[PDB]
Structure formats: C-alpha cells, structure tokens
Design an enzyme around this catalytic site. Structure first.
Site, PDB file in Angstrom:
ATOM      1  N   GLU B  66      43.728  40.368  52.807  1.00 38.57           N
ATOM      2  CA  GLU B  66      44.457  41.459  52.179  1.00 38.57           C
ATOM      3  C   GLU B  66      44.570  42.692  53.069  1.00 38.57           C
ATOM      4  OE1 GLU B  66      43.199  42.599  48.254  1.00 38.57           O
ATOM      5  OE2 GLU B  66      44.445  44.394  48.224  1.00 38.57           O
ATOM      6  N   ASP B  86      39.888  37.392  50.206  1.00 39.50           N
ATOM      7  CA  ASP B  86      39.900  38.682  49.534  1.00 39.50           C
ATOM      8  C   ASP B  86      38.465  39.191  49.593  1.00 39.50           C
ATOM      9  OD1 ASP B  86      40.564  40.914  48.028  1.00 39.50           O
ATOM     10  OD2 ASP B  86      41.501  39.799  46.396  1.00 39.50           O
ATOM     11  N   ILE B  88      37.197  42.061  48.250  1.00 46.11           N
ATOM     12  CA  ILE B  88      36.925  42.447  46.858  1.00 46.11           C
ATOM     13  C   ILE B  88      38.160  42.197  45.976  1.00 46.11           C
ATOM     14  CG2 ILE B  88      36.231  44.276  45.286  1.00 46.11           C
ATOM     15  CD1 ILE B  88      35.090  45.766  47.721  1.00 46.11           C
ATOM     16  N   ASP B  89      38.077  41.148  45.180  1.00 48.02           N
ATOM     17  CA  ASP B  89      39.051  40.923  44.133  1.00 48.02           C
ATOM     18  C   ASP B  89      38.527  41.655  42.908  1.00 48.02           C
ATOM     19  OD1 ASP B  89      41.437  39.640  43.156  1.00 48.02           O
ATOM     20  OD2 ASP B  89      40.142  38.260  42.051  1.00 48.02           O
ATOM     21  N   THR B  91      39.198  45.390  42.905  1.00 48.93           N
ATOM     22  CA  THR B  91      38.887  46.695  43.508  1.00 48.93           C
ATOM     23  C   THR B  91      38.865  47.842  42.493  1.00 48.93           C
ATOM     24  OG1 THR B  91      39.889  46.040  45.609  1.00 48.93           O
ATOM     25  CG2 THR B  91      39.411  48.371  45.302  1.00 48.93           C
ATOM     26  N   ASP B 216      44.219  36.512  46.230  1.00 50.16           N
ATOM     27  CA  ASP B 216      43.617  36.631  44.904  1.00 50.16           C
ATOM     28  C   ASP B 216      43.274  35.251  44.336  1.00 50.16           C
ATOM     29  OD1 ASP B 216      44.006  39.531  44.737  1.00 50.16           O
ATOM     30  OD2 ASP B 216      46.096  39.134  44.259  1.00 50.16           O
TER      31      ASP B 216
HETATM   32  O1  LIP Z   1      43.921  44.061  44.222  1.00 51.25           O
HETATM   33  P1  LIP Z   1      42.766  43.128  43.842  1.00 51.25           P
HETATM   34  O2  LIP Z   1      41.676  43.832  43.200  1.00 51.25           O
HETATM   35  O3  LIP Z   1      42.353  42.481  45.162  1.00 51.25           O
HETATM   36  O4  LIP Z   1      43.335  41.961  42.949  1.00 51.25           O
HETATM   37  C1  LIP Z   1      43.715  42.196  41.558  1.00 51.25           C
HETATM   38  C2  LIP Z   1      43.847  40.831  40.823  1.00 51.25           C
HETATM   39  O5  LIP Z   1      42.606  40.146  40.824  1.00 51.25           O
HETATM   40  C3  LIP Z   1      44.341  40.976  39.372  1.00 51.25           C
HETATM   41  O6  LIP Z   1      44.507  39.669  38.802  1.00 51.25           O
HETATM   42  C4  LIP Z   1      45.661  41.729  39.312  1.00 51.25           C
HETATM   43  O7  LIP Z   1      46.058  41.904  37.956  1.00 51.25           O
HETATM   44  C5  LIP Z   1      45.536  43.094  39.992  1.00 51.25           C
HETATM   45  O8  LIP Z   1      46.795  43.774  39.920  1.00 51.25           O
HETATM   46  C6  LIP Z   1      45.102  42.922  41.478  1.00 51.25           C
HETATM   47  O9  LIP Z   1      46.088  42.149  42.180  1.00 51.25           O
HETATM   48 GD    GD Z   2      41.254  42.784  46.876  1.00 48.93          GD
END
Ligand code: LIP
Ligand code: GD
Ligand code: LIP
Ligand code: GD
EC number: 3.1.3.25
Lengths: 272, 272
Positions: B66, B86, B88-89, B91, B216
C-alpha cells in the site's frame, strides 16, 4: 451496595460461563416478536438463574429482565432497588457464534443506576462501575477519548431489529447524515452493551441508537459515565432510561452534534 | 513455498508486535488523498521493515504494498512470486485504538495466491492458510458455516472510504436491499481482512464490499477458501484480485444471492 455489587460480579462470571459453553453447542433458536427477533433456551435459563439467585439474598428487591417482560411481567421502574438484567445482550451474535455476547446487570435505586456489570464472556473481559468510584475492565481503570471534533471521530451504532421500511429508511438516512459530515467511520459489533463499553475504553468516541431497551443499556451506561463520558437523549436533553433512545459519548460536544444531526424515530416506551 | 510461508508467519508476528506497541502511544496522523484516508508513521515503518527482510532473503521476488504504491510504485501483478502486503489493514481503527487491526501478507505465484497470513495483533490471533492444506487460527482448523438460507444469515460489510454522495447513496441503498430481504443482521468491524477471517471461522456467513484494494484482501482470501468458502466478483463473475470488488461467502448459494441483490459501483482497477 458494595455487597450487592460484589455479589453481582460473581453472578455475572457464572452466567458468562454458561453462555460461553452453550455458544459452541447446538442450539434451539426460537422466535419472539418476529423472524429476526430471536431467543434460545440459554437466554431463558440464564435469566432464571440470575433472578432466583438474587431473590434469595435480596427478597425485597425488584427485577426488570428481558425474558421476564417477555413472559408477561411489566417494565415499570420505581424507587425500590431494581436489578435490570439482560441475560444475553447480542442474541443474534450468539446464535451465529459471532464473538461478542455480553451479560448485563444494572442496579438502580431511586430510579438512578448505582452500579453496572458487563461480562463479555468470549473475550474474557469484565467491565464494572460503581457511582463515584470509577470504571474498570479486568481491574484496570477506563477513560473515554478526548476528541471534541466530530470530523475526526469514530462512531458505533446498529441497524436494529425492525424491518419496517419507513423505520429502516430513517435509520439509514441518520447514518448517511453522520457519515457525510464526514466522520472517520462507523462500526457495529452487534450488541449495545459492548458498543458502549468500547466508548468507555476510548476505542470509539460515541454510540447512538433508537430502538434499544432499558435492559440492553442499564449496565453499560454507568460504565461510560464513570469513565468520564456522558449519556444524553437524542433531543439533546437528559438521558431517559425507559425512552428507547440513547446517545453515549466521550463528551457533550460530540453528544450534542449528533443529536442535532439525527431525526427522531417514533417508538413505544418501555413503560407504556 | 513452505519455507517462504514459515518465514512469512515469523515476519507477520514480528511486525504485529511493532503495531501493537505503537497503538498504545500517541500518533501523528497524516492524510493521503482525503481527510478520511489516513496514514501514520507505523504503516510506513512496518511496510519498509517487511519489504527489506523479505527481499533480503528473496532477491528475485516481487512486492506490492500500500504505502509503496503511495510512494509511486505501481500495482501490477506478474507471474513472478509476489508478496502482497498491507502493513496495517484497519488504519482508522489503529488511529482510534479500536481493537481490530491486522497485518496482512498474501503470496502469489503465476498470479494465484499460494498462501496467506493474517495477524490480528490485539487479540493475539494468527490466521494462516496454504493452498490444498487447510485454514487455521493459532493451530486450530477453521470451517465456514453451513447456512444456505439468506433469511437466516449474518453479513459483514463496510461503509468504505468514499464520501462521494453518489457512491455513499449506492452503498447504503445496497445495504437496505439486503437488510430488508431480511437477513438476521449486518456487522462492521473496520477491516476487510478481519471481516473475511470472521467468515472463515463461521462467525459470519458472508462478507462483501466494493472499493477495497488487492492488499486489503490478498492474505484473507485463501483463508476463506481453505476453510471451505468461495470468492466471487460482485458482478457474478470470477473473483479478480485487481478489480476492487469482492464477495467472500460460506458457499455459492449465498454469494450468488448477494450479487443478485446489489448493484455495482464503477471503480478504477488496481492495475490501471
Ligand atoms: O486503508 P486500510 O485500513 O488499509 O483498509 C481498509 C479496509 O480494510 C476496509 O475494508 C475498507 O472499508 C476501508 O475503506 C479501508 O480500505
Ligand atoms: Gd492499510
Ligand atoms: O436482543 P439483544 O441481543 O438482547 O439486544 C440487541 C441490542 O444489543 C442491539 O443494540 C440492538 O440493535 C438489537 O436490535 C437488539 O436489541
Ligand atoms: Gd437479550
């Protein structure tokens, strides 16, 4: 009341044990007021356990419980010590093995909550709060977040148990209004008591909902306020426990901003 | 690839330690493309660590990440071994201390995911899966639910990161259609990878979303499939890792019923 409270924490641990053994076993899922309003045998037997245990030590006290009010008892809050019990907050989570289910006990004297206990058994988290003494999770003290700016806030809410279109329509448009302010996001974990305990820890900044019952929120409400937060009605006025509406926020700034944004959904009160 | 996989598990647990110490400290929050599109020093720190250690050991391998893409790298997937990362998924969850954040690693060869590792550091939950070898959480084997009736299912989805009013109205309109079928409920935990991991364990019956990215979903996709679930585009077509769209369901009957109900939002692909 500390004796009552010490006793309460003990009961919550025991009922939590029952809930979390049952959650991995096969279930009898029955219907209450509609196909999406559910109840299992565990909801019924845990509430029976709790009420008859407390009655034993404290025979003069009053009870409001979900499954009891379902059985024909009435939800009328008087000045007498009243235990307000939800045996399983998050029954739909329970049935699906979605891992957030709470046991909730609130204790009111003179129609004011004195202490609350919320046991989230799958996580092994015990939240407690006594008026004037602070709020704790597993013996550690809780504090709400310090965010005062709505555009930097994270909110928790639920869609509810009504599938009436006009109702569902107001719920979603209340969500859209807040979402587009914009706020950072909106979460739903599936139970009012846990959503509120997440506000108390400072993980979320505010929770709102219309459609809940007094038993869903009685225990967790004093955990938020003792952690430094605020309870409020959606009009912006004083929280009314029997009104079926709640905003539970880190502070009055965020609480008032939400009240201003959302429209009131018409509901029959717990005391009607 | 088992050596790569054993290495991956070690790296994810390590990085998870960085994330979960950081989450209890103050962050400087930065914006990328919008005021709700957030990044911190830890996202970038953790991705740098992860990419150095891998290419230290595996020089020929490719990488999609990312923050790298945010730094000008392009997200094109070749047949080469590629780590899709990723750091941190979740964030926004991280920024707020909402207790669901995951480190995600998927490994693709010939443009197919071979293994996946998703570390939910706050719970101490390590989800892993290898093609043909099954899905596991901390050594425990996962299996999706058996639900084939949509009216008795529990769904997870997210409101997403767009605040464009046309997009948002579509997201909620799709929500309303499903909610009113009716389904038992809709939950949102704030991260795609954790949402999908809840489908693999059987806690939720299905997840869908449009607007996510390859990083993600790369790790958690093979965890759902190896637990016995199915992936699918929202179009009804085959899942496409670069299409920004996904249904991850327990079975085909549920996935196709969801695709039927919801309308597609036009999105820019990741490889464009
Ligand atoms: O940005 P991030 O925290 O890496 O990833 C997040 C996703 O896990 C989530 O499903 C989505 O709804 C958010 O808009 C964002 O994309
Ligand atoms: Gd992320
Ligand atoms: O029935 P239950 O699981 O005890 O209580 C639930 C509440 O915790 C939730 O906040 C609400 O949205 C649901 O409709 C239901 O009322
Ligand atoms: Gd309940």
């Amino acid at each position: 009341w500390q004796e009552c409270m010490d006793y309460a924490v003990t009961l919550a641990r025991q009922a939590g044990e029952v809930v979390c053994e049952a959650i991995k076993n096969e279930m009898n899922v029955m219907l209450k007021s509609s196909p999406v309003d559910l109840v299992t045998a565990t909801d019924q037997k845990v509430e029976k356990m709790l009420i008859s245990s407390i009655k034993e030590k404290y025979p003069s006290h009053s009870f409001i419980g979900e499954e009891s009010v379902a059985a024909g008892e009435k939800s009328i809050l008087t000045d007498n010590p009243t235990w307000i019990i939800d045996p399983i907050d998050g029954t739909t989570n329970f049935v699906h093995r979605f891992p957030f289910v709470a046991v909730s006990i609130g204790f009111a004297v003179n129609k004011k909550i004195e202490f609350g206990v919320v046991y989230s058994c799958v996580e092994g988290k015990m939240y407690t709060a006594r008026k004037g003494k602070g709020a704790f999770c597993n013996g550690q003290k809780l504090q709400v977040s310090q965010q005062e700016d709505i555009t930097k806030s994270l909110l928790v809410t639920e869609l509810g148990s009504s599938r009436t279109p006009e109702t569902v329509r107001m719920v979603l448009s209340n969500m859209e209004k807040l979402f587009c302010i914009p706020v950072h996001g909106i979460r739903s974990v599936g139970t009012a008591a846990v959503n509120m305990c997440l506000v108390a820890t400072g993980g979320a900044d505010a929770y709102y909902e219309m459609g809940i019952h007094c038993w869903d929120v009685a225990g967790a409400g004093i955990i938020v306020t003792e952690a430094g937060g605020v309870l409020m009605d959606v009009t912006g006025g004083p929280f009314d426990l029997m009104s079926r509406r709640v905003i539970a926020a880190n502070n009055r700034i965020l609480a008032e901003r939400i009240a201003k944004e959302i429209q009131v959904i018409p509901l029959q009160r717990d005391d009607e």
